[PDB]
Amino acid sequence: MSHSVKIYDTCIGCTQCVRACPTDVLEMIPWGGCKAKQIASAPRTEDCVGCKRCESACPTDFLSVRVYLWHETTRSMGLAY
């Protein structure tokens, strides 16, 4: 929020797990101890659309994200044109 859909999990390891999703997710930001030690839920999200391709793969064990952002640009929906 402005893009706020929680995909977080607990491993945040990203090998044979999850990568897919247009730009949005430049992570691998190792928090001082979480197994394959790369963590959190996002980077700077003011860039791309609203997928849930976000999970589909690699756990969120709870919810998984979708549209919830409301405040919604245009570069945030393909169509500002």
């Binding site: 999970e55 405040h71 640009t73 929906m77 169509l79």
Partner: protein
């Protein structure tokens, strides 16, 4: 790329068209949108619905204003024989010269459309008569409906307080209301009917001049204060009456005496007033029940708190249900909705068999397009009742503040609740549907016998312990006598609640196996409709598939694919999904009355009898029989009687069908070809440079579940609207 819409902000600079729609449908969502505080909000709903009451009187005014100069009244009060009253003058330049053809209706000149609302038999039924004597209406109501706005502003202006915290009392208010309001709101009505109306009914006039000089009697309020009341009810009315003109009038207000009459059905003159009186003590006695400073009565907690009936020693709390129904405002608007919802039908199902108006049923049309605008709504409520009680759970509600506490446990022990609900439906499902195809496989197959058909025993039963003195039958302790009442007799149940079988208007219609099904199929409605609303509600919070479904609860429609595949799983989209069965119950139910009534009027009743016990036939004779009149009304052979209606009826079938798009289309396909279709303009001459200010897009992924609906609905509800009328009007019946 500018800034606009003056309340929200994310919406405000959204470059597409969503900018618009979503503007015009977030307006009324005060609690949490930019401009809000618990102080703002409250008052921002307060001077809102002071903007209410206000719009209800510009309605009523004009209701009494397309009536007084045309639209027969110094007619229809000469004797109201079932020939086409009037609402207002229809005036459209599109009309052909068959302006002359009915459409243009007898008495008045230019074409018109007649009162199917009741107003015409209650502006009349409380006296209100003479066409020189009448032309007030707006004049008052409106010199009223403006005041309705004045507080609006006056109480919106800071200074002379708009009041902020003062909005969470109760006790004081409702310790005020159910006395000050209702009680005296009755009373004062009991006042009116009696000094000015009952005289206007049985007896004679009242002259705008005198109000002191007119005295229901010779020697005044006589005793009365002298506890001696009784001798009101002796020779009150009569029956050899001639309604409105005395002569066999008599003059002693109040009664329970006499009863029905071929000249008017309708509750007796008086009784609707001792009643209006009678109840007006109880609420006044009720009002004055809680605190309001002086130091008597009650605190609205401390009689919840550890009150509790089966609590006590059954480990199941009751903590501040007050500061959660009070700190909620949604709990509020949903115990409000229902009560209203339950009673909107109690109104409208009692409003027949007991209509309280001078000529109504024995009208049999206005009587059948008025049970339903009170069945639609009423159903239409209920849903919204159930729908603001699954918002309480998300925006408001507070697990740490409600727990072990009986509103929880309701959540906690929930998986059962929907199941022992769903078990009702699935049972009430196939078991009604065995009985109705079987009943239809057997006909067609040549065997009218073999037909499965249960008498509605526990039905008729309720009534052979009332007045249904149908063809005898004892019942052990009752017999039809020996013991009758003994304790009751010539007081109370006199001629009244004694309509019996009365094939015409007996109140209770004589029930058989045709009614032991619809009556189990209205039951399969509010059950299924509510397994979905109970469910819809019982986790706007979340669940296994979507555990953390919140901070927004209600309308988040959709989620990403994966997990199992996830969709209309917002408590809104179950509300969304609910409204189809509230539009299917409130159809089986209304459908039912009428077929019954229809038949029970200008003809038989055997008709509904062996031809409602099955299904095909519900389509054939009714549905297919009894449309006749209307459709050959555009006829290849000129516009006959009705034409508004059948064109409405096909306007009915279109608005409906055109729901479906919205409903089987789903934004994806629409947006994409608009991606190609907005390569046009940009790439085509004589339509370049020419800029939109809102970016061509396809409808939101919740929006269209609505619009298909809010579309599905009018079509649907505008079809029966036109259907029943377009057939209860010739009739026959």
């Amino acid at each position: 790329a500018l800034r606009i819409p003056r309340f929200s902000q994310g919406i405000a600079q959204d470059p597409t068209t969503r900018r618009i729609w979503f503007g015009i449908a977030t307006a009324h969502d005060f609690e949490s949108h930019d401009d809000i505080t618990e102080g703002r909000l409250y008052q921002n709903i307060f001077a809102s619905h002071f903007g209410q009451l206000a719009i209800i009187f510009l309605w009523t005014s004009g209701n009494l204003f397309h009536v007084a100069w045309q639209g027969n009244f110094e007619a229809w009060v000469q004797d109201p024989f079932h020939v086409r009253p009037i609402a207002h003058a229809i005036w459209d330049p599109h009309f052909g010269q068959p302006a002359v053809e009915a459409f243009t209706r007898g008495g008045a000149l230019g074409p018109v459309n007649n009162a199917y609302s009741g107003v015409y038999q209650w502006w009349y039924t409380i006296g209100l008569r003479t066409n020189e004597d009448l032309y007030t209406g707006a004049i008052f109501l409106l010199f009223l409906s403006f005041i309705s706005l004045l507080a609006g502003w006056l109480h919106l202006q800071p200074k002379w307080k708009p009041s902020v915290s003062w909005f969470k009392n109760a006790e004081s208010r409702l310790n005020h209301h159910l006395s000050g309001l209702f009680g005296v709101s009755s009373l004062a009505w009991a006042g009116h009917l009696v000094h000015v109306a009952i005289p206007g009914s049985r007896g004679e006039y009242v002259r705008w001049n005198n109000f002191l000089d007119v005295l229901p009697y010779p020697q005044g309020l006589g005793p009365l204060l002298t506890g001696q009341w009784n001798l009101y009810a002796q020779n009150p009315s009569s029956s050899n009456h001639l309604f409105g003109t005395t002569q066999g009038a008599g003059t002693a207000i109040l009664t329970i005496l006499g009863g029905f009459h071929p000249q008017t059905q309708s509750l007796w003159l008086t009784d609707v007033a001792h009643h209006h009186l009678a109840i007006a003590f109880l609420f006044l006695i009720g009002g004055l029940m809680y605190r309001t400073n002086f130091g008597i009565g009650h605190s609205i907690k401390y009689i919840l708190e550890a009150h509790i009936p089966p609590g006590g020693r059954l480990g199941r709390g009751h903590k501040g249900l007050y500061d959660t129904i009070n700190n909620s405002i949604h709990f509020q608007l949903g115990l409000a909705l229902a009560s209203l919802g339950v009673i909107t039908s109690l109104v409208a199902q009692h409003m027949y068999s007991l209509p309280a108006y001078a000529f109504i049923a024995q009208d049999f049309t206005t009587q059948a397009a008025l049970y339903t605008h009170h069945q639609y709504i009423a159903g239409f409520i209920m849903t919204g009742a159930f729908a603001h009680g699954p918002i309480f759970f998300i925006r408001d509600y507070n697990p740490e503040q409600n727990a072990d506490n009986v509103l929880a446990r309701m959540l906690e022990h929930k998986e059962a609740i929907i199941s022992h609900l769903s078990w009702a439906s699935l049972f009430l499902g196939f078991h009604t549907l065995g009985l109705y195809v079987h009943n239809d496989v057997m006909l067609a197959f040549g065997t009218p016998e073999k037909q499965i058909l249960i008498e509605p025993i526990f039905a008729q039963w309720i009534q052979s312990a009332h007045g249904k003195t149908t063809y005898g039958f004892d019942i052990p302790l009752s017999s039809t006598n020996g013991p009758a009442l003994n304790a009751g007799r010539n007081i109370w149940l006199p001629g009244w609640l004694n309509a019996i079988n009365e094939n015409s208007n007996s109140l209770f219609l004589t029930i058989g196996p045709g009614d032991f099904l619809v009556h189990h199929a209205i039951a399969l409605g509010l059950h299924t409709t509510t397994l979905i609303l109970v469910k819809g509600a019982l986790d706007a919070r979340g669940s296994k598939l979507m555990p953390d479904k919140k901070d927004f609860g209600y309308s988040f429609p959709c989620d990403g694919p994966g997990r199992g595949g996830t969709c209309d799983i917002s408590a809104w989209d179950d509300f969304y999904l609910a409204v189809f069965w509230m539009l299917n119950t409130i159809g089986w139910v209304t459908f039912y009355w009428h077929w019954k009534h229809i038949t029970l009027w200008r003809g038989n009743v055997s008709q509904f009898n062996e031809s409602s016990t099955y299904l095909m036939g519900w389509l054939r004779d009714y549905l297919w029989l009894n449309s006749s009149q209307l459709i050959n009304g555009i006829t290849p052979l000129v516009c006959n009687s009705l034409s508004v209606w059948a064109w409405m009826f096909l306007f009915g079938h279109l608005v409906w069908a055109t729901g479906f798009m919205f409903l089987i289309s789903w934004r994806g396909y629409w947006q994409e070809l608009i991606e190609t279709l907005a390569w046009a303009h940009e790439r085509t001459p004589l339509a370049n440079l020419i800029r939109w200010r809102d970016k061509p897009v396809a409808l939101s992924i919740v929006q269209a579940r609505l619009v298909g609906l809010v579309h599905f609905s009018v079509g649907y509800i505008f079809t029966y609207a036109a259907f029943l009328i377009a057939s209860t009007s010739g009739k026959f019946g």
